[PDB]
Design a protein around this nucleic acid. Sequence first.
RNA 1: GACCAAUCUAUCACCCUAUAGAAGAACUAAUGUUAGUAUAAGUAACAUGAAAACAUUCUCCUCCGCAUAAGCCUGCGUCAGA
RNA 2: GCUAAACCUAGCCCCAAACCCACUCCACCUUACUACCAGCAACCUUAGCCAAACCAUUUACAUAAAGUAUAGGCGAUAGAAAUUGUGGCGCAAUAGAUAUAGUACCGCAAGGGAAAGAUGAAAAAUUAUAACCAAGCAUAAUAUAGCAAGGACUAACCCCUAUACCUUCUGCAUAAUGAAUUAACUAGAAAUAACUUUGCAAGGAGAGCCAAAGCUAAGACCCCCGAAACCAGACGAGCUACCUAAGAACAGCUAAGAGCACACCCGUCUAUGUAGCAAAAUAGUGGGAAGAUUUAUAGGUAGAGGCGACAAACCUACCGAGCCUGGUGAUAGCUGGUUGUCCAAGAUAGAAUCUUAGUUCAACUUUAAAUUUGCCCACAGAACCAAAUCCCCUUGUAAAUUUAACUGU
Lengths: 140, 97, 187, 99, 166, 115, 95, 104
Amino acid sequence: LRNRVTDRYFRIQEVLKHARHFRGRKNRCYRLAVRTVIRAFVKCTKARYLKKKNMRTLWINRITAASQEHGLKYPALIGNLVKCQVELNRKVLADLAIYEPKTFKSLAALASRRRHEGFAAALGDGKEPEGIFSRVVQYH
Amino acid sequence: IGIRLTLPPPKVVDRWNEKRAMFGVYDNIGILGNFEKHPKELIRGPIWLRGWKGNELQRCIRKRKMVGSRMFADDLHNLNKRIRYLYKHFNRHGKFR
Amino acid sequence: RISYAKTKTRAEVRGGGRKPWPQKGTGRARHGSIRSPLWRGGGVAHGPRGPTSYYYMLPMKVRALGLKVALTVKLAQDDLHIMDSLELPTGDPQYLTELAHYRRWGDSVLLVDLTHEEMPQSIVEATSRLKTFNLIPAVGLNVHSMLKHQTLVLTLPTVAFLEDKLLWQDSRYRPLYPFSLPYSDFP
Amino acid sequence: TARGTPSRFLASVLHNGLGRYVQQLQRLSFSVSRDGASSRGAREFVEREVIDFARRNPGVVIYVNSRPCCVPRVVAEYLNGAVREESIHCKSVEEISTL
Amino acid sequence: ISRKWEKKNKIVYPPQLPGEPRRPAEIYHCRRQIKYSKDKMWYLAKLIRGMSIDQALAQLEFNDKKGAKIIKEVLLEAQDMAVRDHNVEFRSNLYIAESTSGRGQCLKRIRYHGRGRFGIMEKVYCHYFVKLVEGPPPPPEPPKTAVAHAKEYIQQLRSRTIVHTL
Amino acid sequence: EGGQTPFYIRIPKYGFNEGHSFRRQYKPLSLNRLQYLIDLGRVDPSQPIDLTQLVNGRGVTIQPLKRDYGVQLVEEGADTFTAKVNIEVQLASELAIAAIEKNGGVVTTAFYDPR
Amino acid sequence: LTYFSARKGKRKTVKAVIDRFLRLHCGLWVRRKAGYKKKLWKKTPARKKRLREFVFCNKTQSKLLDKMTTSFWKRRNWYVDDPYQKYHDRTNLKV
Amino acid sequence: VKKGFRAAFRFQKELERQRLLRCPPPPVRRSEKPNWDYHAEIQAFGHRLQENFSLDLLKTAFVNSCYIKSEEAKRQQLKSNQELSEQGTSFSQTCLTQFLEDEY
RNA sequence: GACCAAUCUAUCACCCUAUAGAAGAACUAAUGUUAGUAUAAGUAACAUGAAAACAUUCUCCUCCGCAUAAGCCUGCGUCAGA
RNA sequence: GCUAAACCUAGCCCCAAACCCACUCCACCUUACUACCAGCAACCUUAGCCAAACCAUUUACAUAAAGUAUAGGCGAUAGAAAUUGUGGCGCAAUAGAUAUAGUACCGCAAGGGAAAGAUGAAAAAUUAUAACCAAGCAUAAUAUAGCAAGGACUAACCCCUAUACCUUCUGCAUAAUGAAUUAACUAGAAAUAACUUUGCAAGGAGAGCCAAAGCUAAGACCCCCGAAACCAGACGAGCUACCUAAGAACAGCUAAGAGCACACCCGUCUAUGUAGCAAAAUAGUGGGAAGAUUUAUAGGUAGAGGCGACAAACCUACCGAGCCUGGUGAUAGCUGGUUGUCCAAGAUAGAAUCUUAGUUCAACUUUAAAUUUGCCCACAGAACCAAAUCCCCUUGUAAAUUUAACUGU
Ligand SMILES: [Mg+2]
Ligand SMILES: [Mg+2]
Ligand SMILES: [Mg+2]
Ligand SMILES: [Mg+2]
Ligand SMILES: [Mg+2]
Ligand SMILES: [Mg+2]
Ligand SMILES: [Mg+2]
Ligand SMILES: [Mg+2]
Ligand SMILES: [Mg+2]
Ligand SMILES: [Mg+2]
Ligand SMILES: [Mg+2]
Ligand SMILES: [Mg+2]
Ligand SMILES: [Mg+2]
Ligand SMILES: [Mg+2]
Ligand SMILES: [Mg+2]
Ligand SMILES: [Mg+2]
Ligand SMILES: [Mg+2]
Ligand SMILES: [Mg+2]
Ligand SMILES: [Mg+2]
Ligand SMILES: [Mg+2]
Ligand SMILES: [Mg+2]
Ligand SMILES: [Mg+2]
Ligand SMILES: [Mg+2]
Ligand SMILES: [Mg+2]
Ligand SMILES: [Mg+2]
Ligand SMILES: [Mg+2]
Ligand SMILES: [Mg+2]
Ligand SMILES: [Mg+2]
Ligand SMILES: [Mg+2]
Ligand SMILES: [Mg+2]
Ligand SMILES: [Mg+2]
Ligand SMILES: [Mg+2]
Ligand SMILES: [Mg+2]
Ligand SMILES: [Mg+2]
Ligand SMILES: [Mg+2]
Ligand SMILES: [Mg+2]
């Protein structure tokens, strides 16, 4: 032959190194190993958004469970927390609820106070308390 | 397995060989040798071609019309078959037309 | 360069022509003539056919410009050298090698002369027993040999002949017919 | 491909952030080639960048093998014992400096 | 071709010191080219693994199988070599440690079907390896009782940490 | 074109290049070209301006093949022309003939066979 | 079309095009409208006058005719007396 | 016989790596390896911790008694680390006790 | 459009790399071809009449057997090992 | 570790150079390897596939002139002269000649056709290298669940996810074909013309060819396997159909191309067999069995033919006309495939076509370049027998025309 193939086994090894823990011929035969590695890479690249959504849902469920244990709901709690210029993501909320029950208890108390103040305002239109905890701090 | 095991021996190569040290020498004799011999006559190869690029079919027709008078029977038949196949594939089969 | 590789196509291959296992008969893959590129030991589908040749000429002015460029490169690079007569006091390769090493020339000193008939026996014998130094007449000067070697050596007559033959290429009329003809003005 | 690849929890080698800061890089061995077009970048580095790099942090010692090598490599050892033997085959001076 | 089991018998270890164990002597032996299948040889090997040499020979002497006599002769030759060459005093203090049986170099023949066809008839050949280690045989791994299962469950429940957080 | 009458067949025939293999042809020769040649040295006016002199000076490169039987003349450089020399060209017009004669020249015509 | 001949190994020109067309150095192909010599009694004078006039070719048609010809036909035409002498060269053009 | 060479070299390197992975040799001291320095390495180690101290004393602080005995036995065919180590451990214990008493 | 695994050629290299010239220059498939090996699978098919001193005897069947034209060429005798 | 994996040297292709071989001893045209005895032999236009989308006349066997004249269902095409003038940028046992050899094997016949081997200085070295590299197994069998993989997890499973690849077609896991892996072989050769860069310039090229800025030189572009089927001569009546010469067979019983019934000839039916005993077998019921009966031996009838109690049946297992050779690597609007990484632009109104499974033009799309207007645009302008549409300044913008290319729809 003329300048035939002389560097093929290394390609097979590089393709199989990612298949050193599969079942069946997927960890030996190159034909099926190629498709297996391709599918594995595609799924690993597509599962990032799924992982993000799963983590978000898990944090939401944890915060809802903490609120229920403290005596509140997740939507109302989030609304009251947002209605106080106290922006806090869900990860920190879950971490506090897990490793800081007193912090989450104080946060739930503040949320309930804000809820009651908003209800009183909507009922009587203020005049002129405007909620001691309400009244956002203006900026310029 | 397709790949062998033991490496090969040291492929010795004499860069200063008699032909390498004299490769290309005595060429271009026309531009300075008051034009006495064309470089196309320096190459040592076939007799039917010695300074004409051409193509496959053209080279085959050349070899036929220049050596076909003293070629073997089987060789001449194979050359004729090759010429006919090349013609049928070029002047009919292909693309861009 | 003139290639020489030649394969055997499916037609030029010996044997074959029948029809093993008919189409609608056996349940094997459809096949026609044995020795096909899909079989073992058959002919090559596409390959080198006959001895090819990548021959093609270039303008003489392009060659002259290339030679001038090679000369300028060998000169500006502190590699060119001019002499008066390629002679030696004895004619031993050891003496020439020692002189080249002392003068800090290099290893591959390309010596050039003219005529080829006026070569002295001393330098001839000194160069006919080495692998780096080679005696080549001015008539046989190219670019490959100049770029392959390190330094270059020339003499007054060689330089004059080279300059004349490289300047004649400039300021000339059309060839009309091959320059091999006698020509009046041209010698 | 995490299931088929080992993992490790984030941590430090000695909590250098608390007290003093110790350079984790230990030594550097350059295998430059004198005659060879496959180490021009490494040569230019060892010429006009290695001195500045060594003087910018005296807590690291660098060596220069300068042996007949066909592929220039760099051995980056560490205190814990890890070794990162990388290759710098055909690389600009800026790329080698950044690496 | 690849002979190695016969070469393993020439391994040499350095001289042991007084403050060191006895190190049970290992034995290696195998017969090449055996006109027999491989699945039955592996069955016989699995049958003769944890048992000693005496029980192995006793079971082989009453095993209606062609390979039984071959395995018995192989074990007898291995015991003789161990008592003679490898230097071993006790003849019954040897037990089987490893036993396999791989295929050999097979030929090819024709069977001739009832039509214009046929099939390849390979001459299945096999081998037989055995490893006899000095000393008495080890006891069989007893089944884990309920206490072991409870301990494993308690360990698994105690070795669990929070997930997806600090 | 799939089977229909191709475009290059639907057009009828005509005697366009009928006798094209025999129609005499001559390379044009401009008076400005002659003046430029005389000024650049080649084709000196001290000798007859025969076809050999023009071929040597390489002013109008012709070819024996291609049904060419000499060289013709053109009345381009009618003005700013001063050569004064016997010119020999196969064809010539009255305008250029007079333009050359008034300058002291002698216009003539000949016929060169193929060989 | 014959891309490669069987004797010399070169291209071949279709004589039909050479007989039904006319080459010009300017890069255009001249032709003649068909029907200029059949059923002339039923054609109105305007139609007969329009049919007795030459016509040029399109870009694709000109390229096809060129492909069907060789470089030999692209030579000049310094005829002693030809009516198409003032058409081989095109002057006054800006894209 | 494939006309490959670089692929053969890569395969030989892979086989050498596999052999090294098979029977890995014992971990030899880094001092015996080729690329190694003593004075420069000691200076780099001293400058890494960000301070300044004598070099001869630091060198002597690394010489043990068993090492000196082995060197003498080999030569038959540079002080010690007793007082220095004692002072170091005493100072470390005192500092740790003081810190624990001041903070706890 | 930008790169690039393998080879030969001219160039310092020389624990394997660079500049240009060439493609029989780069396989998960063409009921593709060659070589070994899984799959049904140890599944389908299969023979050797009985006792015994291995001398010998017993049970059953037979349209089969004898020599030859056609046809084969040493093809169940001895000697040693399989 | 069983089985395995590599070695490279014998030899092959090209021309470069000469023009080659050929009876020791017997034997060889009769039945070839046969010591021996009365009878004609020779010279033959090659056809055919294929392209014109069929196909009859038609289609090929140093340089320039010139792919010109000329011939041609004047269309697909064919195409002259006078003049001129001693090594491999090769192959290294699936490659190279098929070759260790034209060897068995199919075979009565023409005819087709492969591999043997691997360390070396001593195999008259005992004694083995370093195990490691694919496919099948042992060391080491499985433990809810579901394209065999991911996020993970302190952990294997347990938690959530997602309908194998390629080709076709508007549409896919689809139940449309392809597939058991591994190692080797295996599928884009270039053209008038065009684009980019070198050198000179109204000239260049190492005669010939082109010139109202041109030419030269280089770089870059045109796949494989697959039928039915024809021509000319060999090989084929040892089985089948017919003919020719000389021979053989037909118990017995009842009594004449008579009847039953041995041997014997063929097989109307059942059952088994269906990769079996057999690429056409086993039992009786079946017709004949001194006659149009069967058969041992030899010769003759060969494909546009022979033969034929016509079954258009047979002619060596497949005969609506057996195989081989050389034309045929035939052709083919048709099935299948057409090998490494990454970036960008990238969906078509219709017409013709012995045509709608195919081709061309047009239209869409891509590249380099010169030009200036490209789209919604506002008053208005645009017919007697409803949503609407065309031109359209300022206004948003940056798009549009053309030139030279060429694949793709
Ligand atoms: Mg989200
Ligand atoms: Mg053939
Ligand atoms: Mg072949
Ligand atoms: Mg039609
Ligand atoms: Mg493969
Ligand atoms: Mg299939
Ligand atoms: Mg395949
Ligand atoms: Mg089964
Ligand atoms: Mg029996
Ligand atoms: Mg055809
Ligand atoms: Mg046809
Ligand atoms: Mg002639
Ligand atoms: Mg071969
Ligand atoms: Mg071969
Ligand atoms: Mg394996
Ligand atoms: Mg998976
Ligand atoms: Mg595909
Ligand atoms: Mg397809
Ligand atoms: Mg469709
Ligand atoms: Mg399916
Ligand atoms: Mg121009
Ligand atoms: Mg017969
Ligand atoms: Mg009959
Ligand atoms: Mg019936
Ligand atoms: Mg059946
Ligand atoms: Mg009847
Ligand atoms: Mg009867
Ligand atoms: Mg009777
Ligand atoms: Mg036939
Ligand atoms: Mg064929
Ligand atoms: Mg084909
Ligand atoms: Mg059709
Ligand atoms: Mg299909
Ligand atoms: Mg391929
Ligand atoms: Mg895009
Ligand atoms: Mg029609």
